[PDB]
């Protein structure tokens, strides 16, 4: 089906202790493949997935260049926002950037993104039509004016719809065996008594990919979304994911409940019973 | 491919 590429960078100032630290990572779907860390020795864009190690020195040279150029301007950007907001140089601040494109099953452009957040909230972001900016506030509007004058919008539009899309296609191929794999969740129930009168039923899903999954509980074929405990999906640490849903049950009524699991790699929704 | 950040200055 659809796929996505993403770059996330994070710049955090650390006043009186040096230059801001810049960390950037890149993803294809739910898999990281590169990183850059301004405090690292290599001072180059590094590989974080085997299927990208096959790009030659020119890739690394050009990519390093781009990420370095970005890291230096976001360094300067922190300073500009600081002045824009007239904030104290004593405080630490954060600038985050997200960039990338979505493509469809047919490898064709779907959506493009180019957004900044300052101190964890929206600053400026490119709209769905890739033609105009959404400026969160008065300061961002100064920037929206700079970017308008510099034609950043139309420039990035062309890149998203072009360079980014094509690169995504190349990656999906280079890493076909990994990126286009599908991992059904390996499931199972567990039973945990809390009292003589109650017990926890927990439904597990493990080692699945991508991370998109739906886990639901049903008391005799009926939703329990309010009484179900659901943990945020989580990395197994090996490119797969885990998740669990749970309901507290009055003793005796166990067999009343049912666990339902939907995942891309499951031909049909699974149902589990205690 | 990492974004080409010409003009990204605030």
């Amino acid at each position, epitope marked *: 089906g659809s796929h996505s590429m993403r770059y996330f960078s994070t710049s955090v100032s650390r006043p009186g202790r040096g230059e801001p630290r810049f960390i950037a990572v890149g993803y294809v779907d739910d898999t990281q493949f590169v990183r850059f860390d301004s405090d690292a020795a290599s001072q180059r864009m590094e590989p974080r997935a085997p299927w990208i190690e096959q790009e030659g020195p*020119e890739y690394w*040279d*050009e990519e*390093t*260049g*781009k*990420v*370095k*150029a*970005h*890291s*230096q*301007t976001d360094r*300067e950007n922190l300073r500009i926002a600081l002045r824009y907001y007239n904030q104290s140089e004593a405080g630490s601040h954060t600038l985050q950037m997200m960039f990338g494109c979505d493509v469809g099953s047919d490898g064709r452009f779907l959506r493009g993104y180019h957004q900044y957040a300052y101190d964890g909230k929206d600053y400026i972001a490119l709209k769905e039509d890739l033609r105009s900016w959404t400026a969160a506030d008065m300061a961002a509007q100064i920037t929206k004016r700079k970017w308008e004058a*510099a*034609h950043v919008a139309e*420039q990035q539009r*062309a*890149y998203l*719809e*072009g*360079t980014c899309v094509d*690169g995504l296609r190349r990656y999906l191929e280079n890493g076909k065996e990994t990126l286009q794999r599908t991992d059904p969740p390996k499931t199972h129930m567990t039973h945990h008594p809390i009292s003589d009168h109650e017990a926890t039923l927990r439904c597990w899903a493990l080692g699945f990919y991508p991370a998109e999954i739906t886990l639901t509980w049903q008391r005799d074929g009926e939703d329990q979304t309010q009484d179900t405990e659901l943990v945020e999906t989580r990395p197994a640490g090996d490119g797969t994911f885990q998740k669990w849903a749970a309901v507290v049950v009055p003793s005796g009524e166990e067999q009343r409940y049912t666990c339902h699991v939907q995942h891309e790699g499951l031909p049909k929704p699974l149902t589990l019973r205690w | *491919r990492y974004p*080409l*950040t*010409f*003009g*990204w*200055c605030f």
Partner: T-cell receptor, first 116, second 116 residues
């Protein structure tokens, strides 16, 4: 070899249109091509630019025929004028490995002589 | 994004004499600066590029010396000219990588004929 302008010299009747060829070599995936016109005074004036992700650039009588696969970026000027007579330069722009600046490389130029 | 001016435009000097070309830009702040060279009247070779005040860099080593004592003040110099220093020297400026897509714009250039 980085930027190649095979035509040392070209002539064309006024009012007609001419095409100045340009080929280039780059291992970058993102880049820009620039066209300049050098006046007989030796003044180097900027004309039009072409980005590797943009449609065919067009600006007044100047137009670029971007053929990305071939890495061909020929300039075409229509409705020639006598003062069009000048030397035309093709240039390649690549973000440096340092990220610090854009390295622009120039071809050797083509003299256009428009004929009265 | 306004004005660039270099001086003097024409130079005739004996071997051994000091050289001092100066360049200025107006209407823009903290621009990228460059010294380019045109041997014959064909290829342009980038000699120096300046990312910011006080900063001078070159791709390949040079005998001519360059400097940037102020944001909008650029210099190409020598303490003793070699007859090989003859040539056409162009000053140029551009927006910085961060400020936009760099498009190099040239000054008028300077003809330097070192005579034996």
């Amino acid at each position: 070899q980085k930027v190649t302008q095979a035509q040392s010299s070209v002539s064309m009747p006024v009012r007609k249109a001419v095409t100045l060829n340009c080929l280039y070599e780059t291992s970058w995936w993102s880049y820009y091509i620039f066209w300049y016109k050098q006046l007989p005074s030796k003044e180097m004036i900027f004309l039009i630019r072409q980005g590797s992700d943009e449609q065919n650039a067009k600006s007044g009588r100047y137009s670029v025929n971007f053929k990305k696969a071939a890495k061909s970026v020929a300039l075409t000027i229509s409705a020639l004028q006598l003062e069009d007579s000048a030397k035309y330069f093709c240039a390649l722009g690549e973000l440096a490995r340092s990220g610090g600046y854009q390295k622009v490389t120039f071809g050797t130029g083509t003299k256009l002589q428009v004929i009265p | 994004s306004q004005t660039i001016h270099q001086w003097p435009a024409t130079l005739v000097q004996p071997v051994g004499s000091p050289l001092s070309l100066e360049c200025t830009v107006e209407g823009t702040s903290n621009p990228n600066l460059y010294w380019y060279r045109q041997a014959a009247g064909r290829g342009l070779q980038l000699l120096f590029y300046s990312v910011g005040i006080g900063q001078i860099s070159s791709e390949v080593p040079q005998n001519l010396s360059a400097s940037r004592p102020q944001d909008r003040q650029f210099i190409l110099s020598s303490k003793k000219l070699l007859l090989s220093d003859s040539g056409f020297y162009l000053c140029a400026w551009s927006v910085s990588v961060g400020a936009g897509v760099p498009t190099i714009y040239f000054g008028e250039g300077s003809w330097l004929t070192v005579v034996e």
